[PDB]
Structure formats: structure tokens, C-alpha cells
Amino acid sequence: ADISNIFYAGDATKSNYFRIPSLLALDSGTVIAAADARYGGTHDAKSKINTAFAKSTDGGKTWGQPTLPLKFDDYVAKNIDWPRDSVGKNVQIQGSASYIDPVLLEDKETHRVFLFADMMPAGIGSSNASVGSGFKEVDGKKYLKLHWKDDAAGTYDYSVRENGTIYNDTTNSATEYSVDGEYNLYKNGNAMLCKQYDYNFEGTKLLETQTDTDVNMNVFYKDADFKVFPTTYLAMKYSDDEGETWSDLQIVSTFKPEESKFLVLGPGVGKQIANGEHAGRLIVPLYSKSSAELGFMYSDDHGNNWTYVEADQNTGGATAEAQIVEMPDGSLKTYLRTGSGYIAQVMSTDGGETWSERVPLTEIATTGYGTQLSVINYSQPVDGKPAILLSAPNATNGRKNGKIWIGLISETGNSGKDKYSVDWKYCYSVDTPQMGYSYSCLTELPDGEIGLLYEKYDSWSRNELHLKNILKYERFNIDELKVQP
Ligand SMILES: CC(=O)N[C@H]1[NH2+]C[C@H](C(=O)O)[C@H](O)[C@@H]1O
């Protein structure tokens, strides 16, 4: 029979809505997953969103209680039905910080799991982020900048330095203030507190009000004593015990270009290179409104340092979400969304440092604004060939008609970026052409089965906002997918 949720309204997240699936089988056989826990309807930031996470230790069949490894506490986490009328549907939480659009990655060499998300200061999301990195240089060293509450609004005369100590940069001296690994604020070693906000509707009016509950004050919150520059940040935590415990929060977007408005994640999974001289490199897809649209961050030292790469010179700031697969020789093929009405592919022969021009992919119909996709390597040959799988909608209007494709890789006899071709030989229909189908993430489960976590609705449509239980999990055998329609 069926019968298919990981995250759902009423689970331990206390969220009624979810979006932006991520699904990843670990080298051990454990399977994990993540998604946005979108409390305030299915809206993008600005809102209140935490990153949810869950684990399966029976091969991706039974899923435990979800956890929230990236969370903010300025607004309460609760189950609330967001109005779906013509006016209220548009209403968003105004004053909350958020984590949005997750990426999971495993370093198989060290058995470390990384979870990434975009990290949005209170009231911010991509569309209203300010231009700039949010970091300053003090004596040539990058530090997160901070604005003190009694300084002028545009003045950021403070910085977070070693051990979370907050410095006054006009005198170069340590203050009595610091932040811990959540970026919560301390004064002379004592937790700073503020009241939590609640949210409730009265008709179509959204009331954001302080409660009596004290939470930690945090530099990402709307009226904290010190506050960050209001732009998009990239956050990461790692786990050496498959998500039992997590590290302190790393803000890894030190490299955010000063000309950029936002620089954010391509949701899904990252990749570790298996073959060739960059074997072991970890790479994570990004996009921006900047000098470049498509970009990546990579680490040659198992996660300690990250280098930013621009993949193009597009200043359009389209939603160029990408996912990455590896060819047998270790070169990379990236498949990305664009704002141009096709999925595009770009190639790299130097482990992701440089990339070819976009090739429009014509097997798949998509919309003008586009939809995220998922692409993965498969570990067993298919029809005697190395294979990749792609999941995406397939429709010119609307997010619908989801397919899983299988691509078979051949050496063309040519050189470099032209060395392989892919034959999209198979195409499996997940439901039917009229049924909603948006974001998705594939994984290869330990039994060679394919797992899929996906949005079973049109998450772009202003008429399908704020639907519950649309995030759906299914498993397939490879034979089932080998369809030729
Ligand atoms: C960070 C952010 O706002 N990301 C959003 N970008 C638009 C996407 C889409 O469905 O096209 C998602 O809404 C995504 O969360």
C-alpha cells in the first residue's frame, strides 16, 4: 500500500507547515533528513522558520522524532493555522529571525555531517536584505560587525572577535559583552534576556506581542543591545554522531561579496568528490544577487575552511539553485534552475573552481521563474552504464507533473567539458500531469532503493499557500523507475 511523512503538523517541531526537503543516506546506512519548519504559514523569510532534522536507523523506513538543530527563540514555536483568505494569506510575521533553505552534506572520509541554512536577522529575508557582507576588517582580520543600541542606526563600531568577545573598534578594546555559540548575548558572563514574542490573528490582523517568557537576547533579534548588519548570512553546524549532538553555530559567509544583496544556498545536498586529484573536496551550491548568480563554497580540509567560487558573471540575481553530480573521472556536472525558462547544466574539470557557460537542458519543460531540482549519482550501473537520477517538475505552467529521470553517462571521444554525454533514457511519472509537484530531494538508500522527499503541491502559487502535510516521502526500486514513455 502507501502510507509517507517525516515531518508533519503535530510532530515535535511544533510547526504546522514545512517546505524545502533535504534527504541524505549516510555512509553508515543511517538516513537523515531536513526541511524548513515554517511556523508562520508557508511564507519565505521574513517570517519565523527553524531548520528541522530527523533520522532513520532502519534504512529510511521508520523516522524518529524531529529535532531543530538551527533555531531561533525570539518568537515562540507553535502550531497555528495561517489564514488562507485573499487578504490574510498574504500576511507574514514581521519581526522574527529565521533559518531557511537547508543543505545536508556528509564528509565520508571523516564521518562528519554538516547542516547548512540561510540565516536571516529579525525581519529580514532575501528580498529586503541590505547590500554588503556584514563583516568588517580590523587590522586586516574579518569580524562580524555589530551596532550598539545607543549609537546612530547606521553605525557599527563593534565586532565579535576571538572567543565571542565583543570589541569596541573605535578604541580597539574588549567590552564586558560577548556572544556564545548560538550568538546569544552575555554581559560580564551573565545571559542577557528579552521577552519572547507571540503571534495571533484577529481577523486578518496579525498581532505580534511580547509575552512574559524570557529568552536569551541574540544579536540577530530586532531590538537587542547589539545587532548585526541586516543582510543574509550562511550558517552551519556539524555533527560527529549522526545528529545526536551539534557543534556551535558557524557563520561561514565571511566571503559574502560586498556588492551582493543576498548570497544563499541551493537547497538539497552538497557533494564530496570521490575520484581524481580533488577527491575529498566538499562542495556546496550557492546563488546570489551580485557580480555572479551561480556560485559554490568548497573545503579542501574537511570542513574547517570554505572558499567561495563564482560560476558566472550574471548580475540578474535569479534563483539559480543548483545540485551537483560527479562523472567517473571526477569532473563535475551541475544542474541548475534559472530565470530563463530552462534547466541549465554547467561543467567543471578542476573540482569546481571554474565552470563552463550554461547549456540549456531541453528534455525538461519548466516555468519562467523555475523550480529547484534534485540530482544524484547512483552507485550501480544501469544498462551497463554509470547513472545519475534527476527529480523535478515538468510543466510549462505551474509546479506540477513531477518526474524522476535516469541518465546514462557515455564518453563521447572528445576532451574536457565535452568528454561525457548524458542520455536521459528513462522517465518515471510520480503521479499525474495535473498533480502539484515542487521542491524535491533524492537519495540512494543503503539497499539500492531510491528515496524521495518532495513538496506534493505548487509551492509558487498564491492559491496553494499555507497547506498542511504536503511534504511527502516515497521509495522506489530502480526497476520501477526504468520507464520509457
Ligand atoms: C531564501 C528564500 O527566500 N528562498 C526562497 N527562494 C524562493 C523559493 C521558490 O520556491 O522559488 C523558495 O520560496 C525559497 O525558500
Numbering used by the authors: 238 to 240, 242 to 723
What did the article's authors report about this structure?
Here we functionally and structurally characterize R. gnavus ATCC 29149 sialidase (RgNanH), demonstrating that the enzyme is an intramolecular trans-sialidase (IT-sialidase) producing 2,7-anhydro-Neu5Ac selectively from α2-3-linked sialic acid substrates, the first one reported in a gut commensal microbe suggesting an unprecedented mechanism underpinning adaptation of gut bacteria to the sialylated-rich mucosal environment. RgNanH catalytic domain (residues 243–723) was heterologously expressed and purified, and the crystal structure of the N-domain with the inserted I-domain (NI-domain) was solved to a maximum resolution of 1.71 Å. These include an arginine triad formed by Arg257, Arg637 and Arg575; a catalytic pair formed by Glu559 and Tyr677; a general acid base, Asp282; and a pocket to accommodate the N-acetyl group.
Complexes with Neu5Ac2en, OC and siastatin B, bound in the active site, were solved to 2.00, 2.01 and 1.94 Å, respectively. Our crystal structures of RgNanH inhibitor complexes, including the first published structure of a complex between siastatin B and a sialidase, provide a structural explanation for the differences in inhibition between the chemical inhibitors tested. Siastatin B (IC50 of ∼5 μM) was the most potent inhibitor tested. Siastatin B is based on an iminosugar scaffold with carboxylic acid, hydroxyl and N-acetyl functional groups at equivalent positions to Neu5Ac, an additional hydroxyl group is present at position 3. The siastatin B inhibitor bound to the active site in a chair conformation. Like Neu5Ac2en, the carboxylic acid group of siastatin B interacts with the arginine triad, and the O4 hydroxyl with Arg276 and Asp339. Furthermore, in comparison with Neu5Ac2en and OC, siastatin B makes a more extensive hydrogen-bonding network underneath the ligand via the buried water. Finally, although both Neu5Ac2en and siastatin B form hydrogen bonds to Asp282 (Neu5Ac2en via the glycerol group), siastatin B achieves such interaction without paying the entropic penalty required to avoid a steric clash between the glycerol group and Thr557.
